[PDB]
Design a protein around this nucleic acid. Structure first.
Ligand SMILES: Nc1ccn([C@H]2C[C@H](O)[C@@H](COP(=O)(O)OP(=O)(O)OP(=O)(O)O)O2)c(=O)n1
Ligand SMILES: Nc1ccn([C@H]2C[C@H](O)[C@@H](COP(=O)(O)OP(=O)(O)OP(=O)(O)O)O2)c(=O)n1
Ligand code: NA
Ligand code: NA
Ligand code: NA
Ligand code: NA
Ligand code: NA
Ligand code: NA
Ligand code: NA
Ligand code: NA
Lengths: 375, 375
DNA sequence: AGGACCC
DNA sequence: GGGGTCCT
DNA sequence: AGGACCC
DNA sequence: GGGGTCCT
């Protein structure tokens, strides 16, 4: 009757798990993936040693200091295994929303309902859960809603088995009645495990968070904005005057995060499909030097156009983005001339981006190109 | 081989022509439609007396000063006859782009081609033009392109006959090979006439303009921006250094208006379909007075919601817009809560718009509401 | 959210 | 004036 | 064009 | 870090 069953799939240590598949010799050698001076992520064969995501190399390294590092500044292989996952999930139900390269929501409502359509009266008593149940809560085989959530978790365990048999990947699921809760209950047991949340334990999940910043939807800026007003817990946010919430953020944000704080989230799962933009990015110590920076720009374009091509679609807008020292980024944008779309192409393309460059740079700590408006 | 046939349909004195249909007694009584202190438009039974569009009432009136005026601040009847026109044109070819309440582009390419598909070798010599030919230019019955443009104008004359037999409306057409030129050649003979432009007279059309501001695409601001640099004629704009054009407007605008200045326009005719927004607007002497201005806002909402309803679709964003004395307008915007979409509705709606109001008004010459993001 | 354009 | 469209 | 969010 | 999404 309008209650949903959503699954939130979230792969373990994604990048490190691609590097290990490519290079067995890194199988339980404690592994971190390197981008610039950061350990962007590391394997659980390494996490125990107090090595954390986005930890300094020097820090990550003093700990360990044989832990092993691979460069992961080129995201090609990760983007490619990432879409294989969504594609796999799409085979179950077509409505798959990506969050990042490693998270997916699937709306399982239509599938739970078909399955249960499909059972005799007896085989209805023997419906079992698969994996964890949040807060060790008792199942009631007569609660139409518990019955679905368990069938949910049966699907999830199938999605997980398949991600492993078909892509050699392990990870987590959370089943629950909306995206917020599903995203939250997928982390309870890590790393290669899954959890289902029964409606009666919703407040327990929600109140188990220590910081409002842990709510998907509330950011760094938002949080410190609430902290300023004296709102630190989920309950502070629950009990707090709508009128005061409006006087800081707008009725847009104010009414939405308050729902979030109660565990209430109506957003549907959206079909991501193909991406709305391809971009490429380079970051540095400084730069400033028109001509190489034309280089740096040349580099991004060569790689970008390869990617954009295969897709099949074509993009009708280019973007240039920069950063100074000293964020705090600045962008210029323009359409991509008709005849230029047909495809030669780099030559005329660089001219573009380079005027675009001059419109904000006279007399730089990052450069990046984006193609968007894909048709 | 990739050359198009576009028709640009543009109704005479649109509003005044709706008022005359509703009220015969205004048939050749020299008629102007009034909005506030302006004559927004007047009939040709009145234009000869040097009465012009957007002329003061006092001015429009000293001239004439029995000319007759009707209020046209409520655009309901005009919007309704307007869509009947597009709908009529849609019956010919489905791809109709609106410009305003009174202009339409139809791409006739597929239809000219079918018709000519459809003629015997003889009946190909007897293909005649219908209406004017721009610059009295000779037709060459062996130029595949003249042949189409004439078939174009045969369609246009049918569209016009039909607008008159079916809606009692008269107006103009221009046929030509792109939107820019079609829009330009439709005005050559006014008011109830049509013109076709053969490719050989394109420069004659283009150079017959006196100000660049007369090019559809070049505005008030743009123009005075070029005037500043010493570019006043179409040819000044033609011959003028791409590099200098970029240093004022961007490679976006710079490369596009230069094409325009040569008569070159690749933009396809786009299917407008249903509108992307409904708005309502009120303008005044001053205001300032929270409570009535809640009135003024109440008014717009009552009318807006009526309109929005019938459509069938529903809007997921509301907008509030204001203006000060003293443009120079200021807007706030927010989504329209899920449960509120279902539809009661004014009550919760006003609260919205009124906070939105306070976010820019402390301690006003126009107020208006917009619903957009229609799904 | 503002801003360029078009009627 | 009283509306619209797209782009940034 | 910038800005909030997410990985 | 190196990417993404939507909204204003
Ligand atoms: N700010 C961020 C956040 C994440 N990632 C990357 C690194 C991870 O490999 C990956 C996917 O996101 P997760 O947050 O799920 O991080 P992990 O998958 O690495 O870890 P885990 O499941 O162990 O928590 O994308 C990144 O580069 N920069
Ligand atoms: N700034 C403007 C421009 C136009 N209109 C209105 C008045 C006209 O009735 C109509 C349609 O546009 P046109 O520019 O074609 O103007 P007309 O149809 O009035 O006149 P005409 O064909 O005689 O030139 O919309 C308006 O209200 N405000
Ligand atoms: Na399957
Ligand atoms: Na968060
Ligand atoms: Na989220
Ligand atoms: Na017809
Ligand atoms: Na113009
Ligand atoms: Na135009
Ligand atoms: Na468009
Ligand atoms: Na969306």
């Amino acid at each position: 009757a309008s209650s949903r069953v959503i699954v939130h799939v979230d792969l373990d240590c994604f990048y490190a798990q691609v590097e290990m598949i490519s290079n067995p010799e890194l199988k339980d050698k404690p592994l971190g993936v390197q981008q610039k001076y950061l350990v962007v992520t590391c394997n659980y064969e390494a996490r125990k040693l107090g090595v954390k995501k986005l930890m300094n190399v020097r820090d990550a390294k003093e700990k360990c200091p044989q832990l092993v590092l691979v460069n992961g500044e080129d995201l090609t292989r990760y983007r490619e295994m990432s879409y294989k996952v969504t594609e796999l999930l799409e085979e179950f139900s077509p409505v798959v929303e990506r969050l990042g390269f490693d998270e997916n929501f699937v709306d399982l409502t239509e599938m739970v309902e078909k399955r249960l359509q499909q059972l005799q009266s007896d085989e209805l008593s023997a419906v079992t859960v698969s994996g964890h149940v949040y807060n060790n809560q008792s199942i009631n085989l007569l609660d139409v809603l518990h019955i679905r959530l368990l069938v949910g978790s049966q699907i999830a365990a199938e999605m997980r088995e398949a991600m492993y048999n078909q892509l050699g990947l392990t990870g987590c699921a959370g089943v629950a009645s909306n995206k917020l809760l599903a995203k939250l209950v997928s982390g309870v047991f890590k790393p290669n495990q899954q959890t289902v949340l029964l409606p009666e334990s919703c407040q327990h999940l929600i109140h188990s968070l220590n910081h409002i910043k842990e709510i998907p939807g509330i950011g760094y800026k938002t949080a410190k904005c609430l902290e300023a007003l004296g709102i630190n817990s989920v309950r502070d946010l629950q009990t707090f005057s709508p009128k005061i919430l409006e006087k800081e953020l707008g009725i847009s944000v104010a009414q939405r995060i308050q729902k979030l704080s109660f565990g209430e989230d109506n957003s549907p799962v959206i079909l991501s499909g193909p991406p709305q933009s391809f971009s490429e990015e380079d970051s540095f110590k400084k730069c400033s030097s028109e001509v190489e920076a034309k280089n740096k720009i040349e580099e991004l374009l060569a790689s970008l156009l390869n990617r954009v091509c295969q897709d099949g679609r074509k993009p009708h807008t280019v973007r240039l983005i920069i950063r100074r020292y000293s964020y705090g980024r600045e962008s210029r944008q323009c359409p991509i001339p008709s005849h230029v779309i047909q495809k030669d192409v780099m030559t005329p393309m660089v001219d573009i981006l380079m005027k675009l460059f001059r419109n904000m740079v006279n007399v730089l700590t990052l450069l990046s190109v984006c193609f968007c408006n894909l048709k």
